[PDB]
DNA sequence: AGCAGCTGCACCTTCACGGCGGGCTTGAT
């Protein structure tokens, strides 16, 4: 009848922090010798390019500061000069226990949850969402801006069972588009494990490394952290860039985002791609939220629906509720 | 009738701030705020305005700003236990907090007024001169805005949590367990950290400066504390959180306490 | 107060390459001074700089790449 | 109330967005709460079944590094934040700070069960080491120690097995496993004694912990009294402040079956050591201590000194 | 409609560290092998040479005018005593889709400026552009105290397809000038691959190399770093040079500079010659900033009344426009 | 200090030339003599610098194209 | 026509608030 008041779902499909080494290309399988790259620091010259904000104040001095220069500081990763090759190296786990919630108040909510995803699984195993994992795994999603300029990149997939490879994929990212799931045969495969690992029979430990040729010499891009309160004038940064032990990485969350744009289903435009798992499905950089509550399709009304009413809605859609039930979150009224 | 032209004096202060702070000259906007101003229509709004809560212990709005729960005014027992010890309990008397709604925050600040004790007249319970002091016209009014002014400070409500807040488990010794909700404790050790590292840090410091060589040293120190870490709780607007969290902007300035790098 | 200060830092716009600064009597004797690529270099240059500029007695900090190639008695006087 | 009769290390592991905010007063290293919440958790899952009871977890910390920054012109510093998802109708949402950390740790953990047999002696603990990577330590993930240059295996030593030159043998192997890293542990009769020394005729409680924290490089000739090693303030379990509440009663609770009590921090005082300073491995173990009537729910090192 | 109060771009044109080599002439085939040029570090003897203040007048600082050497330390590249050829190389990475906002707050403004710069490109190509960054890459502009007294300049230009290279251009860089862009046969060829990789449907990665003969053992000027700290006396350099691992070096900035100095239009007398591509036109070594917020000539003001009133300018300021877009930076409320 | 220090710098008003500082008990007894024009013969006068004046123990210093002539046995005392 | 539900808008507090440094922990094969 009545909902819960806390609901938590923990989050599956965990990833570490992407670590980025340099070298050369065609020598890829000899690739552990490899050095790191550094963040340097840079101090910079340039002019006022920004908006002038004229109130309040006197033109004379606004005309002295346009004619004068502006001194930064900031931060950069490059590559070396006689290495065009950027490994990008990170590590996954597939737990597995979907439903089961990590916090239920209602004991009753709790049996019939667990009833709507026993049925779930029992009609549409998780065939889609790991396949649509697979696909994003597939393609170099995973670097942000290090895959527009990129003339090759290639995905090296192992799987670990005890303490050696059991099994290992290679796919080239870039025949793989970023906006259609097609069907394969080794992709296929490792859906195939994906789903098993997801199904509470094994908690599936995965290492994926990606290539990508740019150039010598060339910009890489890693994470940028949020800093709010640079201190005062001659002296801040304005620009900080993320390593661990003294080597370039990308955040996890980052990863975690790449490989979660799987939704197609979004009612408006689907074609324009794939967005994240998000309830009221919203995209930072594009500053407008879809699945509004408005129209009936975001996450709330959706789980409301199909387990307190038992009106079920369309596959496409059980599937987005599964998925927001993989991701994990914060829920309750 | 003693104290009545003081809290006339700070209605007409803010009446004038307003007006100041506003300057709109436009279909009487002034004189639409001196009909409520320099009426006593502001006493009947401050008698109206209900949410504060005068709670110190427990203050739920630092866990997350959007958490509506249950607050409480109330402190622990001491422990029986040595070594380990918290919330101050042994001296230096404590300073209250007002948790609720932004819009109502001045309604504090008409009974915080230095005039024969501030805290006393934010709770005027023990006078008598000034329950009749307050108003001239009648006596229901009276009794009716005292029972209002001391009731938004000290009520009840009901025990409840939040799915954002903190809910751990506890072993027993013999079986089950306990759900142990934490809340954030309103203690000011702010002013301490204030008073070693800017009140008397300057004429110590300077002794150390230029008196080593000489025998000159004042009866007196200093405190350096390396490490200090900021942590903000409201974002522009604190006053959100709670009053105390107005008085110092974010600032909860954490201690270090972090393990030695063997080489 | 009493010796002079020799310090090698690693210069963060190029990684790899490092510089010294001696200080005595309270202000800076030489500033910025180019201390080779690699850690031995700096660890020569630093070792020369408190040989020098020393007098009686010296103190040598900076990194711990750099330290390394110092024996732990060869770093006070 | 415990001995452990055998223990079992567990090797480096490696945490990599822990907490780092861990207490409203202090920052660092995250609360042994987590750890002895961490242990009761593997009894839960694996302990029910092997017939193993699993207590006391002895905290290592190889390494540890944190996400912070000074800002320009301050010596104060300042956290690195995430960047959530929007609220709705393109609004940002309000920035809760929130700190992180990346730990390298071991710990060993005493059983003392009468489960354990002649035929079970090491797949029990690959048994348990197997449980304990699929799960998180204070909010950040175990790292799984993918394919690399070589790996490392658990051990199930027992205590009393053995004669007392081999005890002390078994001792050095395990201490040699363990020993390019430090200890935590409790002093809450040094913080007692402390505050009997520091009261001199005035009254104060806890400026005495902020005393043993700070700096003191004045003195009148300049000197800098010093302190006994590393000391910490740490956050040694919660206080109450309400009633304890019936199962159904509290609105919005955990779970339905539980009574709930409305509680608050408390501070004590610890010390990082060296694991070869000690020359006791049944020590450095960290246990709950309730009292269920009168709130002060507490953990500690017992048996220390 | 009205202005996003978050709105950036990304960075086309994206250049790497310049090196330099010193050799003989007449080697230029065989130019892989020369060893580079190291920076060097001097002591001098100078004498006061400053304007004495009004303070000055003293016999106490007429000594100081009298008899004073000045005692300074300062670095210094030089060409080697049987060599005179300086040979800088760098890569060069021109990307496309210049339009596209990389980050956003509205869904309307966004819509209408893609809508602005695809009937720009439906009306007219990056032609022109094209055209003026092929040409400033043509005359060597990137040696800028390097190019006033050297005897001879030679640029030379491989497209590297697959790691190797797949067409070559040979240049004279003092024959095409400074002050007028004009036409011929293989800078054209060259400013339709980079219009071709600037529009989307390729992939530009170029190697560029110049050649600049000086004189034997003479002095070649690297960029000079920007100390921000606080100044001091007698304990400072006040002259440190950039190098790369032992090797002297131009900044990315500073060569990025060099090629991007198409802008010829502007309400002073454009006659003169081109200036950068900066909102509020500014030169601020000169100490004038052209198109200035007074007039209607700037970045901003043309910007909006193009997207919003759809107000378009003259087709000069059109191509100015879209070079800011091409640029980058941060244009928002 | 007790052990004798022998340091090797290159000259950076000319590069590649090399220097020598020998350090003897807190006094220096060679001050920034001409050691060679290469890592080898740098190399050879801080051995011979070595062998002279460093008659309980001794510490070579340098570069890393310097001590790569040398083994790595050879360089501590 | 009369309650439930959603969206827009007014209300409110407070000046950054110092730098010449400052500690205590590190094994044995």
């Known amino acids: 009848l009545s909902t819960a008041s806390v609901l938590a779902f923990e989050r599956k499909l965990d990833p570490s922090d992407a670590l980025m080494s340099a070298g050369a290309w065609a020598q890829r399988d000899a690739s552990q010798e490899w050095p790191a790259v550094t963040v340097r620091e840079k101090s910079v010259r340039g002019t006022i390019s920004n908006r002038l904000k004229t109130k309040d104040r006197d033109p004379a001095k606004l005309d002295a500061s346009i004619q004068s220069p502006n001194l930064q500081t900031v931060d950069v990763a490059n590559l070396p000069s006689d290495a065009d090759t950027l490994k990008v190296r990170f590590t996954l786990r597939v737990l597995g226990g979907a439903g089961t919630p990590s916090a239920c108040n209602d004991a009753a909510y709790r049996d019939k949850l667990l009833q709507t995803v026993a049925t779930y699984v029992n009609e549409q195993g998780f065939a889609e969402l790991a396949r649509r994992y697979a696909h994003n795994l597939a393609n170099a999603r995973f670097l942000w801006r290090n895959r527009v300029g990129a003339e090759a990149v290639e995905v090296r997939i192992n799987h670990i069972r005890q303490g050696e490879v059991a099994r ?81 990485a990308i955040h996890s969350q980052k990863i975690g985002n790449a490989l979660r744009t799987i939704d197609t289903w979004y009612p408006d435009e689907d074609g324009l791609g794939p967005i994240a798992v998000e309830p009221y499905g919203s995209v930072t950089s594009q500053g407008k939220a879809y699945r509004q509550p408005k129209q009936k399709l975001d996450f709330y009304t959706l789980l409301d629906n199909w387990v307190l009413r038992d009106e079920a809605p369309a596959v496409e859609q059980q599937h987005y509720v599964i998925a927001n039930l993989i991701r994990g979150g914060v829920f309750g009224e | 009738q003693e104290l009545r032209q003081f809290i006339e004096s700070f209605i007409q202060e803010r009446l004038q701030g307003k007006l100041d702070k506003l300057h ?154 306990h759900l142990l909700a934490p809340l954030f404790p309103t203690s000011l050790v702010h002013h301490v950290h204030a008073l070693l590292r800017e009140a008397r840090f300057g004429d110590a410091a300077k002794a150390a400066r230029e008196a080593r060589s000489r025998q000159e040293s004042w009866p007196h120190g200093f405190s350096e504390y390396p490490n200090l870490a900021i942590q903000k709780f409201g974002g522009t607007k604190p006053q959100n959180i709670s009053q105390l969290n107005s008085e110092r902007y974010g600032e909860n300035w954490l201690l270090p306490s972090l393990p030695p790098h063997w080489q | 107060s009493r010796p002079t200060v020799v310090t090698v830092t690693e210069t963060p716009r190029n990684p790899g390459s490092y510089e010294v600064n001696v200080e005595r009597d309270g202000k800076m004797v030489v500033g910025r001074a180019r201390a080779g690529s690699d850690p031995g270099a700096a660890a020569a240059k630093a070792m020369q700089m408190a040989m020098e500029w020393g007098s009686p007695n010296y103190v040598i900090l900076g990194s711990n790449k750099v330290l390394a190639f110092i024996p732990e008695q060869l770093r006070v006087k | ?104 740790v071991s710990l060993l953990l005493g059983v003392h069960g009468d489960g354990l047999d002649d035929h079970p002696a090491q797949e029990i603990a690959r048994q348990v080491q197997e449980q304990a990577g699929a799960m998180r330590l204070a909010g950040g993930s175990i790292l799984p120690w993918c394919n690399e240059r070589f790996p490392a295996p658990n051990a199930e030593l027992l205590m009393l097995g053995g004669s007392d030159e081999q005890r002390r043998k078994n001792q050095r192997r395990l201490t040699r496993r363990l020993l390019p890293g430090f200890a935590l542990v409790s002093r809450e009769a040094l913080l007692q004694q402390h505050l009997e020394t520091l009261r001199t005729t005035l009254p104060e409680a806890t400026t005495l912990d902020a005393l043993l924290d700070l700096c003191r490089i004045n003195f009148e000739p300049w000197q800098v009294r010093d302190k006994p090693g590393w000391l910490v303030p740490i956050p040694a379990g ?68």
């Open chain 1, 168 to 248: 290992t994929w290679r796919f080239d990212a870039l025949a793989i588009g970023l906006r259609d799931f097609k069907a394969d045969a080794e992709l296929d495969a490792l859906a195939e494990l994906i789903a098993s690992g997801l199904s509470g029979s094994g908690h599936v430990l995965l290492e994926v490394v990606a290539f990508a040729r740019i150039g010598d010499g060339q910009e890489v891009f890693p994470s940028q952290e949020l800093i709010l309160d640079k201190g005062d004038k001659k002296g801040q940064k304005s620009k900080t860039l993320y390593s661990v032990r003294d080597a370039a």
């Open chain 2, 24 to 177: 709109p000259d436009e279909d009487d906007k002034r004189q639409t705020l001196l009909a409520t101003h320099r009426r006593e229509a502001w006493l009947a709004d401050a008698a109206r305005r209900v949410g504060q809560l005068q709670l110190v212990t427990h203050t739920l709005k630092p866990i997350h700003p959007d958490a509506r729960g249950s607050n409480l005014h109330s402190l622990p027992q001491a422990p029986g236990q040595p070594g380990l010890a918290g919330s101050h309990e042994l001296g230096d008397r404590l300073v209250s907090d007002v948790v609720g709604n932004a819009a109502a925050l001045d309604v504090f600040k008409f009974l915080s007024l230095q005039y024969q004790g501030k805290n006393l007249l934010n709770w005027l319970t023990e006078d008598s001169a000034e329950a009749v002091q307050a108003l001239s016209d009648n006596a229901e009014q009276a009794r009716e805005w005292r029972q209002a002014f001391i009731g938004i400070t000290a009520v009840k409500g009901a025990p409840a949590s939040h799915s954002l807040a903190k809910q751990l488990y506890f072993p027993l010794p013999g079986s089950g367990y």
């Open chain 4, 1 to 104: 109330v415990t001995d452990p009769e055998a223990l079992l290390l567990l090797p480096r592991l490696s945490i990599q967005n822990a907490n780092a905010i861990s207490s409203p007063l202090t920052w660092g290293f995250p609360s042994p709460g987590a750890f002895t919440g961490f242990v009761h958790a593997l009894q839960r899952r694996v302990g029910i079944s092997l017939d193993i009871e699993l207590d006391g977890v002895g905290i290592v910390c190889h390494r540890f590094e944190a996400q912070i920054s000074q800002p320009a012109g301050k010596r104060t510093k300042v956290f690195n934040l995430t960047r959530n998802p929007l609220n709705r109708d393109g609004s940002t949402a309000a920035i809760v700070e929130e700190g992180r950390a990346h730990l390298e």
């Open chain 4, 238 to 305: 919660y206080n109450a402040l309400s009633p304890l509440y019936l199962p159904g009663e509290v609105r919005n609770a955990r779970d339905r079956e539980t009574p709930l009590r409305f509680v608050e921090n408390l501070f004590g005082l610890g010390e990082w050591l060296s694991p070869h300073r000690v020359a006791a491995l049944s020590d450095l173990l960290w246990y709950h201590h309730a009292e269920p009537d009168k709130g002060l729910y507490r953990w500690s090192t017992p048996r220390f000194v």
